[PDB]
Amino acid sequence: DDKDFLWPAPNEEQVTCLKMYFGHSSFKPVQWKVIHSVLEERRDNVAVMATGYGKSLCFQYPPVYVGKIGLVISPLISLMEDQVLQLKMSNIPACFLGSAQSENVLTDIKLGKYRIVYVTPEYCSGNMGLLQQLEADIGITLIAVDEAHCISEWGHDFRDSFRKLGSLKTALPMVPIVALTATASSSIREDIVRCLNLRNPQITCTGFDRPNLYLEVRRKTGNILQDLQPFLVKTSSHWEFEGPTIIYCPSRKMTQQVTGELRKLNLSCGTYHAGMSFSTRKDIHHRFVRDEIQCVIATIAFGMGINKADIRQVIHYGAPKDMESYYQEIGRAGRDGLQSSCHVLWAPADINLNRHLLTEIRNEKFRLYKLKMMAKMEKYLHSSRCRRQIILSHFEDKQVQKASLGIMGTEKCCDNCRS
Numbered sequence: 001d002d003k004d005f006l007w008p009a010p011n012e013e014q015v016t017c018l019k020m021y022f023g024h025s026s027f028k029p030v031q032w033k034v035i036h037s038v039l040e041e042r043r044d045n046v047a048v049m050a051t052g053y054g055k056s057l058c059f060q061y062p063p064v065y066v067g068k069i070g071l072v073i074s075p076l077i078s079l080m081e082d083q084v085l086q087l088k089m090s091n092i093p094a095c096f097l098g099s100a101q102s103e104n105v106l107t108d109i110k111l112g113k114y115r116i117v118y119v120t121p122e123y124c125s126g127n128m129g130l131l132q133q134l135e136a137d138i139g140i141t142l143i144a145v146d147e148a149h150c151i152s153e154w155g156h157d158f159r160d161s162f163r164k165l166g167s168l169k170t171a172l173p174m175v176p177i178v179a180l181t182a183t184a185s186s187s188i189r190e191d192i193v194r195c196l197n198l199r200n201p202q203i204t205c206t207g208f209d210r211p212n213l214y215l216e217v218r219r220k221t222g223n224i225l226q227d228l229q230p231f232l233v234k235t236s237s238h239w240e241f242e243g244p245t246i247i248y249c250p251s252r253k254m255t256q257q258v259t260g261e262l263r264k265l266n267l268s269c270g271t272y273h274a275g276m277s278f279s280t281r282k283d284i285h286h287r288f289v290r291d292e293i294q295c296v297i298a299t300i301a302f303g304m305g306i307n308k309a310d311i312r313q314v315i316h317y318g319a320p321k322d323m324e325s326y327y328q329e330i331g332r333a334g335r336d337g338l339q340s341s342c343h344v345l346w347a348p349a350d351i352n353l354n355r356h357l358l359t360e361i362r363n364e365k366f367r368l369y370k371l372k373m374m375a376k377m378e379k380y381l382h383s384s385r386c387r388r389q390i391i392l393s394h395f396e397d398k399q400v401q402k403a404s405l406g407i408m409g410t411e412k413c414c415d416n417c418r419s
């Protein structure tokens with residue numbers, strides 16, 4: 001089941017509701033990440049989706065399941081009308097609220113007859129008083145701002161109508177905003193977060209094929225120089241990686257061991273883990289961005305807010321924590337769009353394939369969740385099937401796989417496609 005790899009597990013009624021109103025059996029990890037964070041954590045989201053495949057469920061499902069109201073702010077008039085119609089046909093009361101439509105629907109919206117109200121930024125700008133009445137009388141499950149990049153003066157498609165959506169978090173400080181956009185740009189994501197006044201927002205990014213990322217899994221010997229010598233070059237009587245490199249290790253001890261071996265080659269490298277100070281980490285982080293140090297030997301702590309476009313190589317030195325961590329970490333490779341490589345150097349020895357520490361966990365559902373993820377992680381590494389297929393099938397909507405067939409079964413896809 002998909003639900004075996006979701007935390008927390010969707011309850012029977014959440015599944016029932018999904019089948020009845022949307023006609024789906026399962027939530028994809030990103031959808032569930034966004035939906036659960038809206039429902040339980042009431043948490044602001046920036047959800048980047050290259051396309052609209054699986055997009056609508058993220059903002060439509062929560063108000064429908066709680067039976068309250070969801071606001072969808074968008075300038076894409078015709079697509080809002082199409083979704084308003086598909087909702088109506090699914091027995092989900094929905095309307096396009098605008099100045100012309102007001103006389104017809106506004107009383108029914110104030111009375112709580114609608115699950116999902118689509119508005120323009122222009123109309124929402126003029127009616128902050130209304131939304132507060134809906135929050136007071138009904139309770140707003142979420143505000144979805146689509147084409148959220150239009151709030152950025154620095155993007156390709158600016159709209160003055162998005163300026164005033166900065167007020168939403170003043171009018172409705174307890175209501176979560178789900179910002180949606182097709183751009184993976186780090187600076188546009190920064191602009192969206194600032195302009196919409198989002199508070200510690202959840203960042204997801206899906207719909208992308210990432211053809212420039214190559215996937216390989218090889219057995220590690222354990223010996224650190226033998227394992228990593230294939231990744232090094234000899235130039236100017238010294239040693240270095242091909243380009244900017246992150247080596248992710250399962251423990252704080254391994255980051256010290258791996259660095260200590262690369263130190264013996266005078267390789268431009270630096271360590272990052274929890275135990276180090278924030279000044280030395282901000283040095284390591286700033287030296288990486290300015291290309292002063294070529295490698296960062298990292299625990300899971302190094303990752304969020306790197307925003308470095310030209311990471312050429314990610315090495316998992318040891319089996320990843322799980323497919324979730326693995327996905328987040330390799331996704332940091334090749335954000336410039338240029339050819340990068342993602343190699344896992346794994347052994348069954350590795351603590352992240354060691355089932356004993358899950359036989360410790362006395363909380364049954366959480367133990368049995370952790371076992372399934374450790375099992376899913378082993379099944380990926382043990383696989384002789386296409387690695388790109390496994391990761392897209394797990395995390396991405398089934399559309400993304402159709403587009404990525406080109407790269408798949410070719411030299412540049414993965415070790416298993418090279419046959």
Ligand SMILES: Cc1ncnc(C(=O)N2CCC3(CC2)OC[C@H](C)c2c3c(=O)n3nc(C4=CCOCC4)nc3n2CC(=O)Nc2ccc(C(F)(F)F)cc2Cl)c1O
Nearest residue numbers: 184203205208209210213303304305327328331335388391
């Ligand atoms: C401030 C801040 N706060 C919180 N967290 C982070 C953070 O550290 N991260 C969040 C975002 C992040 C990377 C990690 O994690 C989710 C997925 C992961 C993801 C991410 C990402 O930053 N980007 N950027 C692209 C671009 C697409 C095309 O143009 C260039 C750029 N795509 C993604 N993807 C999808 C992907 O990479 N999906 C895939 C698709 C195929 C494969 C394949 F290799 F299996 F084929 C692997 C992955 Cl991960 C952060 O920085």
Ligand SMILES: [Cl-]
Nearest residue numbers: 020021090091
């Ligand atoms: Cl129904």
Ligand SMILES: [Zn+2]
Nearest residue numbers: 386413414417
């Ligand atoms: Zn492949």
